[PDB]
Specification:
homodimer, alpha/beta, TIM Barrel, Immunoglobulin-like, 2 domains, six-stranded antiparallel beta sheet, 12 helices, 22% strand, globular, binds a molecule of 4 linked components (NAG-NAG-BMA-MAN), binds a molecule of 2 linked components (NAG-NAG), binds 2-acetamido-2-deoxy-beta-D-glucopyranose, binds ligand VLN, pharmaceutical (chain A), Alpha-galactosidase A (chain A), signaling receptor binding (chain A), disulfide bond (chain A)
């Protein structure tokens, strides 16, 4: 989408994975979808260094609207859970130096059953623009056919442009194209800033395995289309919750950096361990994800329960991730010819290698003929930056 | 097994899950199956409070033997990886105040392909006794028929008794009896101190889920036979390794306590976090697991992606575990009528409830009419002790 936005993968916070559609504000006040939740989350994004690290977009997922539209036929926020309205929430978020994302659906209803946008694309686009929305996640539930789906997505894109406001457009279009047909990713990139490809993520290592395996299996279809202005979305970051071990959290961070993925945290910033905060705020790994070249990485090797991924970076630098998929035993040894890395350019004539995950450690100079030796934890990942150099 | 042993579930350390069959002592001297590894683990079991917590048995799994038997036809440890022999290793372990477990197989070969004990049951039993072995894990690979399997397990049991040495006898008989026929668990308890029921564990929440589900699905068959001298073995504790989140480790600890399971750590005691060390050395949870009454807990309730297990304890006390099996969202609320717990006697007329996991916290007094409300983390478990007001 050529709207000047998402020149690097969008960074922020989305409530869906962690808070879901909790409507019971009387019995579960701390987890229900309310304006107080988003206000407190914005406060913590500022105070706890999340904005400094790059997380800019505070995003509302499903279950923010009233059961029906107002008298004029416009979307209205829920009266009890959002008394002061989306405009006042956007004002608050902007006053903290952040940006506000909102949710809508292309069909007649949202996935949770709230008013859909079909028939009101222009009305809803102008409503979001007036409220001060900076990002729109557009879902695909309750849609008849591919004609309706495609037309709705393209229509909402053009309507948002016609509002004249800069609004990041996050689509779920490709994901909703199966079981009908394989998406034309060029068409989708034409209209979307990023697009969800695969099923929703949950708080489990199984889910990350599934997302990564699907991505590596379909990488010839989706890697080259990604770039500044249009990204593949493998869904939210679940670091800081309950289902991932430390090494699995490291794996998700490293490979979301490799995949040039939008970094949308879905956690409770009020209850997050120092470990997970440091991982999610890792300056070097975020720098990899935010590389100005904007070239998505890919799976280089796969076998012996090992995976090797790499991502090209600006200035002849490369990121390399090595995953141990063996879920038994201990740290497993892996060696690779340094010339096999970075298409043979990362370490020609030499490269300086810096391990970034699980710990940061300078590994030294590697000649084009040398071999890299590493040990990877079960379900863990070793992330490295290779800086091309002529010294040595 | 009425040999006076395993009156509480056996506690110790087994190398299999974490170290497997690592024979590459040239490239990984510190991780290969060698007497140096077991010496380091014994040293740390003393130094780091593991013996104090109750972990007593330092056990050797497969891949300790030489490729073949000696002149006399006896088992021998690997010459290079175990230079000083099992007897001297046992002497060292005993000098540290610990006990030594060894591994053998009922069939023609061990699962890794090393000398089996079929045909040598008496010889091998007497050899282990001479060496000073205090525990035998008996595997079931490379076995012709169910008859050979059963006969071998009973034979080795009786041979160990005839050596005159107190040796804890750990069997894998039930695991190798399915899917051919259902094991007679009374028969097995007659010959074994504990017995492996289900597939091997690995460093994954999936493995723990499968073990728990199998146990609850077959609980009508296996719960009542367990007791002092004979326990169900859901395989090793993998807390402290790589595949489990904190809450999944909490779940494993709590429900291995509920299940009156042998507590066999399989980890690297040289590199273990303070968190996992504190969980594995939890005094109250170990006390639950080591409850002298020896009544195995069971799944009381299952539904809404929630699980409720409970175990009767000594002195009219009860342990209650609540699992959240929903792997998405956040801490989920669960409420239960306190009268529904402990067969309806735990809190009649009242009970004091103490949460032990994930954190220790006094919850106060609960009348027989009260409801217990809790929030359980996804894939996590809340463990509670109920003390009746008497
Ligand atoms: C509505 O849609 C139209 C297109 O249908 C869209 O117009 C496009 O806007 C982008 C972004 O402003 C334009 O790209 C810029 O072009 C100018 C002129 O050449 C350059 O100065 C810009 O370069 C800077 O920014 C780039 C990042 O985009 C960097 O790569 C560069 O190094 C500079 O820093 C940039 O190339 C584009 O030309 C137009 N296209 C058309 C056909 O008009 C408009 O922005 C949309 N509006 C809304 C509100 O959505
Ligand atoms: C061999 O088996 C006998 C018979 O089961 C064991 O004898 C029992 O030992 C316990 C020890 O506390 C006593 O409480 C039982 O009363 C004994 N039963 C009988 C019938 O004698 C004996 O312990 C076993 N010995 C070894 C070395 O395993
Ligand atoms: C399981 O095996 C046990 C013994 O191995 C069986 O119990 C024995 O049954 C015989 C039958 O005459 C009695 O004489 C013995 O006294 C019993 N021994 C014990 C220790 O109970 C038992 O019946 C078998 N179970 C099933 C279901 O067949
Ligand atoms: C919404 O419902 C109307 C009335 O049944 C139908 O004509 C229309 O196609 C629906 N919209 C979508 C996007 O399916
Ligand atoms: C994809 O869509 C674009 C624009 O809609 C079009 O130019 C292109 O031919 C399409 N590709 C395929 C393979 O249909
Ligand atoms: C071991 O092998 C021999 C020869 O093949 C066979 O007769 C015997 O039954 C086997 N024993 C077991 C326990 O498999
Ligand atoms: N893919 C289905 C989508 N619908 C949910 C909101 O109802 C989440 O936004 C999810 O991303
Ligand atoms: N059930 C299979 C058994 N065989 C392995 C040793 O080779 C482990 O002891 C495992 O417990």
């Amino acid at each position: 989408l050529d709207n000047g936005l998402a020149r690097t993968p969008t960074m922020g916070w989305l409530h869906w994975e962690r808070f879901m559609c909790n409507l019971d504000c009387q019995e579960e006040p701390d987890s229900c979808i309310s304006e107080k939740l988003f206000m407190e989350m914005a406060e913590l994004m500022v105070s706890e260094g999340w904005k400094d690290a790059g997380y800019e977009y505070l995003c509302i997922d499903d279950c923010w609207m009233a059961p029906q539209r107002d008298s004029e036929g416009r979307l209205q926020a829920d009266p009890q859970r959002f008394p002061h309205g989306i405009r006042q929430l956007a004002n608050y978020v902007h006053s903290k130096g952040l940006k506000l994302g909102i949710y809508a659906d292309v069909g007649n209803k949202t996935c949770a059953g709230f008013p859909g946008s079909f028939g009101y694309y222009d009305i809803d686009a102008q409503t979001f623009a007036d409220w001060g929305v900076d990002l729109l996640k557009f879902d695909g539930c309750y849609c008849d056919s591919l004609e309706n789906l495609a037309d709705g997505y393209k229509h909402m894109s053009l309507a948002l442009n016609r509002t004249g406001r800069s609004i990041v457009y996050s689509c779920e279009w490709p994901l909703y194209m199966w079981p009908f047909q394989k998406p034309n990713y060029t068409e989708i990139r034409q209209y979307c800033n990023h697009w969800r490809n695969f099923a929703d993520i949950d708080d489990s290592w199984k889910s990350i395995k599934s997302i990564l395996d699907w991505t590596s299996f379909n990488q010839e279809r989706i890697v080259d289309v990604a770039g500044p202005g249009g990204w593949n979305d493998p869904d939210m970051l679940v670091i800081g919750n309950f289902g991932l071990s430390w090494n699995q959290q490291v794996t998700q961070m490293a490979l979301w950096a490799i995949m040039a993925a939008p970094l949308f945290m879905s956690n409770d910033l009020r209850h997050i361990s120092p470990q997970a905060k440091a991982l999610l705020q890792d300056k070097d790994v975020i720098a990899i994800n935010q590389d100005p070249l904007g070239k998505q990485g890919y799976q280089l090797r796969q076998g012996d329960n090992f995976e090797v991924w790499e991502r090209p970076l600006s200035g002849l630098a490369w990121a390399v991730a090595m995953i141990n998929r063996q879920e038994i035993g201990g740290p497993r040894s892996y060696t690779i010819a340094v010339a096999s890395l970075g298409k043979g350019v990362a370490c020609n004539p030499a490269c300086f290698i810096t391990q970034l995950l699980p710990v940061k450690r300078k590994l030294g100079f590697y000649e084009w003929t040398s071999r890299l030796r590493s040990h990877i934890n079960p379900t863990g990942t070793v992330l490295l930056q290779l800086e091309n150099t002529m010294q040595m």
